[PDB]
Amino acid sequence: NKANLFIISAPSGAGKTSLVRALVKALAEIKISISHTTRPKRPGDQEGVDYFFIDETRFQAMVKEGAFLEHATIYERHYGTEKDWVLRQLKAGRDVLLEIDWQGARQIRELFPPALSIFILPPSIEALRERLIKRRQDDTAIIEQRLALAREEMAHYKEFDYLVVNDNFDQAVQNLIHIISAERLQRDVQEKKLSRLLAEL
Amino acid sequence: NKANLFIISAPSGAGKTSLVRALVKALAEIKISISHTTRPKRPGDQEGVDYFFIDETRFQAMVKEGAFLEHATIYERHYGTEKDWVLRQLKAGRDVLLEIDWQGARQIRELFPPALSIFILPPSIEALRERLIKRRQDDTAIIEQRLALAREEMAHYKEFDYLVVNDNFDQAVQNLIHIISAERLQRDVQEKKLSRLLAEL
Numbered sequence: 541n542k543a544n545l546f547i548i549s550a551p552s553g554a555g556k557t558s559l560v561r562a563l564v565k566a567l568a569e570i571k572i573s574i575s576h577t578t579r580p581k582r583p584g585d586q587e588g589v590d591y592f593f594i595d596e597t598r599f600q601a602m603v604k605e606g607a608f609l610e611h612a613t614i615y616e617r618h619y620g621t622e623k624d625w626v627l628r629q630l631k632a633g634r635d636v637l638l639e640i641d642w643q644g645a646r647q648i649r650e651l652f653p654p655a656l657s658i659f660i661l662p663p664s665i666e667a668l669r670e671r672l673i674k675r676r677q678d679d680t681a682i683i684e685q686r687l688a689l690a691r692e693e694m695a696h697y698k699e700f701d702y703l704v705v706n707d708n709f710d711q712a713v714q715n716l717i718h719i720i721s722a723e724r725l726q727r728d729v730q731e732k733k734l735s736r737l738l739a740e741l
Numbered sequence: 742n743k744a745n746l747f748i749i750s751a752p753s754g755a756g757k758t759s760l761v762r763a764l765v766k767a768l769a770e771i772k773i774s775i776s777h778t779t780r781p782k783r784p785g786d787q788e789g790v791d792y793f794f795i796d797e798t799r800f801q802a803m804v805k806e807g808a809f810l811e812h813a814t815i816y817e818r819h820y821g822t823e824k825d826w827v828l829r830q831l832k833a834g835r836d837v838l839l840e841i842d843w844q845g846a847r848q849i850r851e852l853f854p855p856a857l858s859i860f861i862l863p864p865s866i867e868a869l870r871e872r873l874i875k876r877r878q879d880d881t882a883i884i885e886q887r888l889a890l891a892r893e894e895m896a897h898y899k900e901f902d903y904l905v906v907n908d909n910f911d912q913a914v915q916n917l918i919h920i921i922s923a924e925r926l927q928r929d930v931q932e933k934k935l936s937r938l939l940a941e942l
């Protein structure tokens with residue numbers, strides 16, 4: 541009952557989306573924020589599952605309205621975290637996972653100090669290229685551009701609280717579980733959850 | 742290869758010693774500091790296993806010599822953490838567990854800032870009395886005195902980073918594992934352990 545935000549960032553092709561989806565299956569009382577994006581809906585994508593897919597007009601509206609807790613521009617497209625959904629989850633006592641880039645992370649850290657951030661590292665640059673190329677949904681020409689953006693994303697790893705290497709899926713998931721589980725044992729969180737016990741003693 | 746100190750504190754009778762012993766069996770690269778004490782050696786106690794049992798003359802000597810990283814007086818007896826052994830472990834890249842009281846914790850926090858501290862709570866005051874009474878090695882008259890010292894120890898829980906309830910042994914051990922495991926995934930620790938990978942990228 542002292543819910544927190546858990547920021548997860550990684551270069552494209554690091555396997556972050558899959559890790560986060562397994563994480564929420566393994567843990568209770570934690571949900572993934574579904575972002576809004578102007579990035580074109582790809583074959584395979586599902587509205588309300590991968591993203592809320594909208595156009596620039598809609599997204600710009602939300603920005604001016606202040607509907608986003610956080611928003612950024614990435615590869616000439618827009619992504620943002622709808623503010624109200626997140627706050628409803630926190631109110632309900634559920635932790636929230638934010639799969640956002642380094643720019644969004646900076647915003648969240650300012651706005652919600654207790655937030656913890658985790659950076660997912662690939663075991664090699666070649667691992668990124670491999671995973672990205674195998675996504676037939678993606679253009680195989682923007683690769684050299686996406687990999688360039690990946691190295692720049694990774695240069696920001698120093699801004700994060702934890703680093704986790706995705707070299708073995710199960711182990712990486714287990715490490716994410718350690719990090720969230722430990723947060724939930726912090727004195728600040730426990731003062732609330734153990735209110736009755738601490739009262740007795 | 743960025744080893745840390747993990748302080749474990751709890752009122753007498755909370756089952757801390759047993760938890761810590763199971764913890765070191767479950768994790769690698771972590772060792773328990775064996776303290777020096779003037780507290781009389783009890784039936785069942787083993788030299789170099791439970792404590793290094795010495796007399797006041799020896800202990801006072803160590804204090805004046807500065808042989809202790811940390812030392813305190815508890816129930817009119819002396820306990821301390823020999824400094825050199827701990828530093829050797831850290832140098833070797835091994836984390837160190839310190840089973841010390843709240844006074845010792847304050848000293849360690851000053852002396853070694855990265856240190857994390859965990860307070861073990863009993864599920865009830867009656868749990869302490871039960872566990873203590875069942876220790877036939879202990880005098881059953883000092884109980885009301887030890888329980889008084891337990892409530893005063895527990896009032897210091899606010900000085901600790903994490904709170905863990907020992908209501909189920911396996912679960913409490915698993916929570917200790919989360920806490921140490923998460924520390925080892927911190928960016929500061931990972932900058933060292935992942936030096937080669939970060940170099941490649």
Ligand SMILES: Nc1nc2c(ncn2[C@@H]2O[C@H](COP(=O)(O)O)[C@@H](O)[C@H]2O)c(=O)[nH]1
Pocket residue numbers: 549550551552575576579610611612614619620621639640641642643644645
């Ligand atoms: N700041 C921010 N970044 C996001 C958000 N959603 C996705 N991203 C970032 O945008 C990148 C592009 O994701 P993609 O277009 O590959 O699905 C992600 O890897 C992530 O770093 C968001 O809501 N806010």
Ligand SMILES: Nc1nc2c(ncn2[C@@H]2O[C@H](COP(=O)(O)O)[C@@H](O)[C@H]2O)c(=O)[nH]1
Pocket residue numbers: 750751752753776777780811812813815820821822840841842843844845846
């Ligand atoms: N400060 C400090 N406290 C210790 C040390 N060793 C044991 N203690 C504290 O002294 C208490 C008494 O332990 P006992 O006499 O029951 O074995 C422990 O519960 C612990 O809080 C030590 O090396 N330093």
